[PDB]
Amino acid sequence: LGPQVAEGENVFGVCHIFASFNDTFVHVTDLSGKETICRVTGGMKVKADRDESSPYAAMLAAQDVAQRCKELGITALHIKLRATGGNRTKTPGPGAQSALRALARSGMKIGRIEDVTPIPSXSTRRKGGRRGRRL
């Protein structure tokens, strides 16, 4: 099923890769970003909570996303990386690189790659305290 597309033509979804230090999201939408095609989360594929954000868990999430997209006809993806952002960290998580590689290795093609991490033009105060999270 899906869209009735020609031989050489490809169709684009947008893949939102949200990669925090606790968990990894491999959400795939349409081009408008409104219609979810498939969302598989990195903590859907493991048992321990410590392995939610491991790169092996983001790989398994990335494989079961592309398998779901190609049986809806989606051929290529624009990539949107995303860290936590805001007051929190701006570097994307450990499963950011391994999901993007595994998405490429499973017969899925790549459009643009962008960064849509929330960046405060300012910020409310962070959740640490003044002396700030000592351990």
Partner RNA sequence: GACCGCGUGAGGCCAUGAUUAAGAGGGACGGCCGGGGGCAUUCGUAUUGCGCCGCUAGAGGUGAAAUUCUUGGACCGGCGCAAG
The residue ranges that bind RNA (CB under 7 A) are 16, 18, 20-23, 25, 27, 29, 32-36, 38-39, 41-44, 48-50, 52, 82, 85-87, 116, 118-124, 135
Q: Give the shortest CB-7-to-RNA separation in angstroms.
A: 28
Minimum distance between the CB of residue 62 and RNA, rounded to whole angstroms?
14
Q: Which amino acid is it at 115?
A: D
Q: State the CB neighbour count (10 A cutoff) for residue 125.
A: 8
Residue 6 vs 32, nearer CB to RNA: 32
The beta-strand segments (E) located in 7-121 are 12-19, 24-29, 36-38, 76-82, 109-115
- Sequential DSSP letters for 110-126: EEEEEE--------PPP
Nearer to RNA, 19 or 102 (CB): 19
For 91, the token pair is: 């570097």
CB of 109 to RNA, least distance (A): 20
Shortest CB 67 distance to RNA, Å: 14
Q: Which is nearer to RNA, 58 or 102 (CB)?
A: 58
Cβ atoms of residues 54 and 39 within 8 Å: no
Nearer to RNA (CB atom), residue 8 or residue 87: 87
**Complex with RNA: residue 7 or 35, whichever CB lies closer:** 35
Shortest Å, Cβ 75 to RNA: 19
Phi/psi-derived region of residue 55, left when phi > 0, alpha when psi is between -120 and 50, beta in every other case: alpha
